[PDB]
Design a protein around this ligand. Sequence first.
Ligand SMILES: *Cc1c(COP(=O)(O)O)cnc(C)c1O
Ligand SMILES: *Cc1c(COP(=O)(O)O)cnc(C)c1O
Lengths: 454, 455
Amino acid sequence: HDIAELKRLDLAHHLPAFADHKVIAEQGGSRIITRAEGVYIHDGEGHQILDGWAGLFCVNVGYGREELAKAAYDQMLELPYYNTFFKTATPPPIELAAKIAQKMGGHLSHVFYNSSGSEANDTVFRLVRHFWKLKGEPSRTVFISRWNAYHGSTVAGVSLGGMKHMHKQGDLPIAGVEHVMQPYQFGDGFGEDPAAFRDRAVQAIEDKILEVGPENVAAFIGEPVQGAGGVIIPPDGYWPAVEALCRKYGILLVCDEVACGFGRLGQWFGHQHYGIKPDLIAMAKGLSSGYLPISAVGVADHIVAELREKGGDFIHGFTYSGHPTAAAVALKNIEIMEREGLVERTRDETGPYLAQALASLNDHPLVGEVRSLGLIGAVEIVREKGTNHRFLDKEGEAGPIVRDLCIKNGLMVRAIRDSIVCCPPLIITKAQIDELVGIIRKSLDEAEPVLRAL
Amino acid sequence: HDIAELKRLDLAHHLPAFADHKVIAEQGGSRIITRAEGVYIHDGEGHQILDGWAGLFCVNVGYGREELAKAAYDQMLELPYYNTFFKTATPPPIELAAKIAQKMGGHLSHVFYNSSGSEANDTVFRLVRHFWKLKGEPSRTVFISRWNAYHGSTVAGVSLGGMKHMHKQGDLPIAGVEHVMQPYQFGDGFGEDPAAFRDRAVQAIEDKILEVGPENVAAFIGEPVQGAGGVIIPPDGYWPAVEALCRKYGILLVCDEVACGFGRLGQWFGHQHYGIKPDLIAMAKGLSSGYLPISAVGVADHIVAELREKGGDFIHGFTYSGHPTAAAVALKNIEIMEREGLVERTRDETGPYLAQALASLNDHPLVGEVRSLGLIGAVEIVREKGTNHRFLDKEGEAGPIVRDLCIKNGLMVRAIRDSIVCCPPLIITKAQIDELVGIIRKSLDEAEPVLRALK
Ligand SMILES: *Cc1c(COP(=O)(O)O)cnc(C)c1O
Ligand SMILES: *Cc1c(COP(=O)(O)O)cnc(C)c1O
């Protein structure tokens, strides 16, 4: 590879995602990643980087899976593409559907296929509203979400999400979406009793339901753990109370499993850790470990019963819905996870080990709080020990500084506000977990003098 | 494959797209497609079917490309995925970006990556509105489209599209989207002078611009040829007049190239056939010939200038934006098109031949009109020769009947209302074009007695 040419071509022809393109230009183009193996990334100048984010919350089985490349090759030779539009289907999405249904459990029996997690939430949006029309309750149209939630980057995905700065671009959210407080203990309930803060966050949902009018509410949607929002782990008892709220007013419960799904929290889906029974779930990312684009919506049997008994077209779907090659890779990816027991390993081995390893950072003068569940975790950066006070009293200044030192020291982790977030592949060893935490501590030590000088 | 078992699993676990699931259940599950080669499809019960729709307007290089399977395998070994979120990129999307920009021409210099054509229009929606905010014209928010347009299946894609029945599901369109008449001569301008009907269709866009308020309009979006709507080919002079309209009121011109792109109309992009210069285009389907999911938005240089000069995050993108394996396959797909010259072949050879072959159906008692451009075409079904009158005076009855007979006779074509539309892979031979048209005529002959017996 000609790295200088790829950087020039990047600026001249490529618009990266979630990027300030003035910043990209000022650094002379994007940083070129050329190869990867196991849990490590290699860039244009030869630097080995421990990928503490598994690509983008997705590469769960790790890099270097020749077995997955082979699965794609074989299916592309036999049948690279056909549609599911013409009363037709192909083997791979059908066999993958039965496998996903096995992992979803409960009444989640069917899947609708898309490509990205964002589309899956578009599918949730249209299917939920169509379902209530078939049920004879057409007034049920409003979706209730939370501030700092992330549900994708489509128009509907941004609307369902709670990123106010993301809402601005596109003049979003669209109508029929409401947002309430997030159960963020460290930021918004610091010093509150967890049970009392939880009740406040649950009550905010009920207040919104009553304001909208229960007969007008279609569903509540939420991530089991808010990933892109900074690993917001809700207090104990939050999700059971939210489910009871949904059942009380007869609204659907939707869990966005795009990040929490497929082993991230020690379960096949995040909602199973909390023992709740959603009516729909969105999934992607870890579905194929990012090896090929594919996503799906898990659909409850009683939703399918309306489609099967009332009839009528559900006028919804994408060209690549059920793509046989992407489906075959996702199927093999699940089989690799089953074979190697990566879901159980996260719950019983690496998850707890990550929790103890991150807890050793608690004594650092810059660390306000560490938290983790399975193989996702966050480290809070504070200017005053024992508080949630942030440097310059302006969240987002200290974060990037610590992040850049981690990257300089060979660890790819990201800063969400002043929270350093990690999300490594599920194959990470305990020694590599110690390496990850070691680099964070090393970067915090270096960050201390520059942060004090702000 | 255990076909009976797959049908069981299909009903028990799979929700197909654009489907009546009661109908699927009543037939005992979806029809299983197992393998394909060249332009032919094979199902569970052994039937060979000429794929007159190239999968779903997408399989342009045809089936059986081991070269594309190899390109995917090699890239997945070296680097299966990394993101473009962290000021990072990988070689394949960068190399694909330069190739696409070379084919787009004009001021279309940059691409933003997604997975589906629907997402591409979501990217158009947010980028156009963000662009006008950076330009200091925040009132420019409204998109103008057309009835019977198709722009995807996301909430924004359905909103931008003009399928009224699709709008109902989801209670769409969202605010800030207006729809005007489609330039459908056969259905809505039968007996009108084409130039006067064209002017009527262009004036409806201007009327909407003035109603919304020119300072409040962000862009006009349209397919060069309306694909899913039934191959609606606009009258001559329509698109040049539409471009002038956009330039007159200073609004952006967006062409949805997801179906028309990559050789379908004899050009790398449909708008190039009409000589117009859109500010943004959406592309997918033929981008990778459907071999892997990938899509892109072509972005004009002056749009990028706002991002580069004003700065600020464009808070938009997908996990698989710029997926290296999908990009490598799309790049190899374009190289196959270049090597085999399918773009020039469609413009000069197979495109005109399809028009000549379809024109032989003009003498059939059921055919009201045939039309085509490149390798997409439509055959109108009428109950009265020389009119646009439809069987039972209710569009959509005759269509499915002729379509089902085509499928029985070994040709996969679809009926849009009472229009039989074809869109075969670009590698189709002239003999296979004659086979396709022959099966259509055979099915029309068989359909004539049952259609005359309606009611
Ligand atoms: C990543 C993410 C999405 C969006 O998924 P894409 O494939 O990038 O469109 C949606 N919801 C959650 C919880 C996510 O983490
Ligand atoms: C196919 C189509 C779309 C939607 O593309 P998907 O990949 O199915 O989401 C958008 N616009 C046009 C013109 C199309 O033909």
